[PDB]
């Protein structure tokens, strides 16, 4: 029978960090549907609105088996006298499970499926794909801010914000004879590099190298949380006009955004949790990014002509944060696709701006390091807001859930009978 | 409330009125505290009376019902398929009932210092209609108001997430189990993040699966202006159910008009068989 598991949510977090806003434990065989409707607000910013932030709300299903593996299987089999499922440990702070959208129990411990569940959802859909998994054991092992506000999500695809995989080959040797090459061996050489290149660029995931075989893999083959629903939108608001002697001609942008998310009814195969997370981000607009062709001094035929034959046939080009940013070290490199500068265009911000707080732009220079300079650098948004004890953004939503089960009943459980 | 005279009721009970009950939550509507978690049948040393046992169950049933639903005569009656006049149990007769949610709008500050700051203004037009009513005997008609906020605490945790080792009984939601064991005694500690292991209350098995607490991020519990429950519950059953008003003092600015004020025009109309204004002052 319909079980109304509705509840209110009073949220808040940083800019480019994934954070759990709601979770509902589900049992095997029940149908789950939710209607999440609220408003998203940003902290008051220092001037008028200039650029809308984009918001992504995700609802996933992670069965317990996925989390406890064989331990869970045995638990279900063993039944009533199964050994209790050991929760996970947390860090000394009421805001020490935040990322799990839950208050750490009185003993500072929490469900592993809440932890691993979360871990599994990031390492499978947010973490850059050449990147290493968050193999955190317990929330007491994750960085303070990773578990306060959540781990950093990736910046919105730019030219410099989506470099080619760093382990990307720029050459490939075939050991040849001293005065002869094997015309047939060469052929083969190319076949192998192909298979390698594909794995590097597109199939870094099993489920991915499979799909290109024309097959399919159940979220049960690779233990990946199942993405049930996804909502995306741009949050906006209005400016407030100051009207006293001193702040007459001054404004403060107020971002109030009504949003809604609908998770269509869903059949829960096994017992598990449904995680609903939010992520607020701004387009990667840096105040000092230059057009590659304008930042790289001598222009050769290969750079300026856009000869099809050329672009379509040479290795990825290794560039530095220096051919894209005005002061940046010659030393911080990344691999780009030849002619990439012709498939795109950076946003452009006049110098008059780079000295102004209140603009949701990237002031600072990138981060020499690949990873870090891709997964967004949240902190470079601290200067955009006024005062804030409600982080960068806060949310007030009413999670209207409806679960259809085969439950006892309230009176038949308390009725020894 | 067996108060004799208003000079006997607590200062604030008779200033602003007695405390009404919080809106039903999981922890805010515990099972009756006197609720039995077991029942013994005195058996023989090496035998039990199969027929006596049967009977044992019949009596406990009648007891359990009184405990959970029929704590009122008028109630133990109704389950007999009968009815009792408000005159049988001397209960005030509820003539009309209106319920609504009050709202308003925010006011935008616009000076140098409070530009980006707001103040919520709650103006709510309401109306209540008591349909014509035939007064059997002489008496008074009382009209009372009660303003409340949903019991949102800033530190309530999901039972399953606050109770450490999860057993098969807690996590599987086996119908057979939930539908057949005694009420579970829990503590303010399996629901609130600091709360004493010692403050108990009885919950229905699997109650954690029929419900969901509201959730408030820690960033909030340090913020005055939010009509939420900051403080921890009240170790005591009663007190921690009938709402803890005071935990709302911090939500308002300045106030010499309490927490809420009302301006209403009570349009009444009574049809009698009265003398008249001139025929009473007319000795005649």
């Amino acid at each position: 029978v319909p079980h109304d598991l509705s509840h209110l949510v009073f949220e808040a977090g940083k800019i480019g960090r994934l954070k759990t806003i709601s979770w509902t434990p589900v049992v095997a065989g029940d149908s789950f549907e939710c209607d999440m409707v609220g408003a998203i607000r940003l902290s008051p910013l220092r001037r008028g609105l200039a650029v809308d932030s984009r918001v992504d709300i995700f609802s996933f299903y992670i069965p317990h088996r996925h989390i406890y593996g064989q331990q869970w299987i045995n638990f279900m089999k063993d039944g009533v006298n199964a050994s209790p499922l050991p929760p996970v440990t947390c860090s000394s702070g009421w805001d020490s499970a935040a990322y799990l959208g839950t208050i750490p129990s009185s003993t500072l411990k929490v469900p592993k499926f809440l932890h691993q569940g979360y871990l599994n959802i990031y390492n499978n859909y947010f973490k850059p794909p050449w990147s290493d998994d968050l193999t955190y054991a317990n929330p007491s092992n994750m960085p303070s801010e990773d578990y306060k506000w959540g781990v950093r999500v990736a910046n919105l695809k730019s030219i410099w914000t989506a470099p080619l995989p760093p382990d990307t080959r720029t050459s490939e040797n075939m050991t040849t004879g001293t005065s002869t090459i094997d015309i047939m061996g060469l052929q083969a050489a190319y076949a192998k590099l192909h298979t390698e290149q594909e794995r590097d660029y597109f199939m870094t995931r099993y489920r991915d190298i499979m799909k290109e075989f024309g097959g399919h893999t159940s979220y049960d083959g690779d233990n990946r949380p199942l993405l049930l629903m996804r909502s995306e939108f741009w949050a906006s608001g209005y400016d407030v006009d100051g009207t006293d002697q001193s702040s007459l001609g001054q404004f403060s942008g107020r971002v109030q955004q009504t949003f809604n998310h609908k998770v269509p009814r869903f059949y829960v195969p096994e017992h598990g949790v449904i995680m609903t997370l939010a992520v607020t981000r701004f387009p990667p607009t840096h105040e000092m990014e230059m057009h590659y062709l304008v930042g790289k001094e001598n222009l050769t035929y290969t750079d300026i002509a856009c000869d099809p034959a050329l672009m379509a046939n040479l290795p990825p080009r290794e560039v530095s944060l220096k051919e894209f940013f005005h002061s940046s070290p010659d030393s911080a490199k990344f691999k780009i696709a030849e002619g990439q500068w012709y498939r795109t265009q950076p946003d452009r911000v006049a110098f008059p701006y780079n000295a102004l707080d209140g603009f949701p732009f990237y002031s600072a220079l990138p981060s020499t390091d690949l990873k870090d300079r891709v997964l967004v650098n949240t902190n470079n948004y601290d200067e955009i807001f006024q005062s804030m004890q409600l982080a960068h953004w806060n949310m007030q939503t009413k999670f209207n859930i409806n679960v259809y089960r085969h439950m006892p009943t309230t009176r038949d459980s308390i009725m020894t009978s | 409330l067996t108060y004799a005279n208003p000079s006997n009721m607590p200062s604030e009970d008779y200033k602003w009125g007695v405390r009404v009950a919080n809106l039903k939550s999981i922890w805010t509507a515990p099972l009756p505290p006197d609720t039995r978690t077991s029942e013994n049948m005195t058996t023989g040393t090496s035998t039990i009376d199969i027929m006596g046992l049967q009977a044992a169950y019949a009596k406990l049933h009648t007891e359990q019902e009184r405990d959970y639903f029929m704590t009122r005569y008028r109630d133990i009656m109704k389950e007999f398929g009968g009815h009792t006049s408000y005159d049988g149990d001397n209960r005030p007769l509820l003539l009309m009932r209106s319920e609504f949610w009050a709202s308003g709008y925010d006011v935008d500050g616009t000076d140098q210092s409070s530009l980006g700051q707001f103040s919520g203004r709650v103006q709510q037009t309401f109306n209540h209609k008591v349909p014509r009513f035939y007064v059997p005997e002489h008496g008074v008609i009382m009209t009372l108001a009660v303003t409340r906020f949903p019991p949102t605490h800033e530190m309530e945790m999901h039972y399953l997430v606050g109770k450490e080792n999860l057993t098969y009984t807690d996590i599987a939601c086996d119908p057979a189990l939930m539908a057949n064991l005694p009420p579970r005694e829990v503590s303010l500690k399996e629901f609130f993040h600091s709360s004493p292991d010692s403050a108990k209350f009885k919950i229905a098995e699997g109650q954690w699966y029929r419900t969901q607490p509201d959730r408030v991020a820690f960033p909030y519990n340090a913020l005055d202006g939010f009509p939420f429950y900051s403080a921890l519950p009240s170790t005591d059953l009663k007190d921690r159910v009938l709402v803890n008003t005071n935990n709302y003092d911090e939500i308002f600015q300045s106030m010499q008009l309490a927490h809420w004020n009302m301006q209403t025009k009570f349009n009444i109309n009574v049809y009698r068989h009265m003398p008249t204004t001139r025929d009473s002052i007319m000795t005649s």
Binding site: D4 | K24, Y68, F69, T71, D75
Partner: peptide, 12 residues
């Protein structure tokens, strides 16, 4: 759905 809260009657 079905009832839940049981106090021992009606509580306003």
């Amino acid at each position: 759905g079905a009832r839940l809260w049981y106090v021992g009657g009606t509580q306003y």
